[PDB]
Amino acid sequence: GRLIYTAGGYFRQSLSYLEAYNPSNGSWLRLADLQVPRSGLAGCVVGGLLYAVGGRNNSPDGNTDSSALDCYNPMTNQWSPCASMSVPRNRIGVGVIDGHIYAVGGSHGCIHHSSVERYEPERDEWHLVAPMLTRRIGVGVAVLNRLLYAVGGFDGTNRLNSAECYYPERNEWRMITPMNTIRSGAGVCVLHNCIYAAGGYDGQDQLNSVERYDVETETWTFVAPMRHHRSALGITVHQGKIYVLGGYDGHTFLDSVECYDPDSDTWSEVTRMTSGRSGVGVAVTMEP
Numbered sequence: 001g002r003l004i005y006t007a008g009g010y011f012r013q014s015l016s017y018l019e020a021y022n023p024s025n026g027s028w029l030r031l032a033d034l035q036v037p038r039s040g041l042a043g044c045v046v047g048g049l050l051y052a053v054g055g056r057n058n059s060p061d062g063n064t065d066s067s068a069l070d071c072y073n074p075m076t077n078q079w080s081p082c083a084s085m086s087v088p089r090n091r092i093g094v095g096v097i098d099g100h101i102y103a104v105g106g107s108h109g110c111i112h113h114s115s116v117e118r119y120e121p122e123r124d125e126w127h128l129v130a131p132m133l134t135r136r137i138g139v140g141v142a143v144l145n146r147l148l149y150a151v152g153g154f155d156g157t158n159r160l161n162s163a164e165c166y167y168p169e170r171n172e173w174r175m176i177t178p179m180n181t182i183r184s185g186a187g188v189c190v191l192h193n194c195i196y197a198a199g200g201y202d203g204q205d206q207l208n209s210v211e212r213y214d215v216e217t218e219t220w221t222f223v224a225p226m227r228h229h230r231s232a233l234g235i236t237v238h239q240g241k242i243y244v245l246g247g248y249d250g251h252t253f254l255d256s257v258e259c260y261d262p263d264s265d266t267w268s269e270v271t272r273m274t275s276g277r278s279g280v281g282v283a284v285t286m287e288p
């Protein structure tokens with residue numbers, strides 16, 4: 001696409017912001033608010049539409065986990081409700097395969113889901129698929145070569161370095177090599193033939209380390225760390241570079257946005273969000 005969209009998030013309470021950053025000229029645009037504030041959601045794009053999935057509304061008047069799927073049309077600058085998921089999913093992970101949205105894990109109250117469901121936009125309907133081998137919230141999800149990966153998270157008792165892969169034509173999950181680091185709330189994305197896991201929380205500290213999984217070799221290698229420790233960051237890829245947005249570093253809710261160039265193996269600060277926040281949903285699509 002052309003713009004990096006950031007939806008929702010958390011600072012003092014769950015947020016309704018939708019803002020779009022243009023890497024070509026550095027500018028931010030504030031767009032139509034989410035109908036309901038939410039943090040811990042995931043974002044994704046299918047057919048030029050932006051989707052906001054799951055999350056939780058942490059508010060003065062209570063706290064409600066979200067089963068909502070909401071669609072944003074850049075041409076109209078309007079959000080529309082879509083079919084809700086079977087269950088609320090806070091700290092959700094999402095990935096897209098063949099035009100379908102997979103919702104992975106997350107929490108509802110003290111329930112930590114291992115369940116997974118798939119949304120088909122052409123039918124506006126959700127269907128459950130095979131559950132993961134492990135309950136995971138704060139799970140990172142990415143897609144490579146039509147396979148879905150769930151990385152890290154928290155199972156209700158332990159934070160995880162484990163990861164697993166979903167094979168759609170077998171409707172089956174299999175464990176892959178665990179990361180070298182325990183990470184909850186890491187940013188997970190795909191670049192070239194590798195799954196990247198950036199930042200997160202290991203139980204004691206927020207992380208700046210970054211490692212990547214080569215699917216051919218089945219090994220995790222550390223790359224250069226980010227300039228700022230952060231968990232509950234947003235992540236996306238734009239023209240071959242990784243962008244990480246916001247997060248929580250144990251002291252401050254970050255407005256920092258960093259950009260990773262895999263050819264130089266370096267991170268640089270590229271912009272700041274209009275305000276610090278964590279738990280945003282991020283995706284890339286056309287200009288509104």
Ligand SMILES: NC[C@H]1OCCc2sccc21
Binds near residue numbers: 010039185201248279
């Ligand atoms: N570790 C990040 C964490 O910070 C406190 C509030 C929220 S909402 C989503 C994630 C988070």
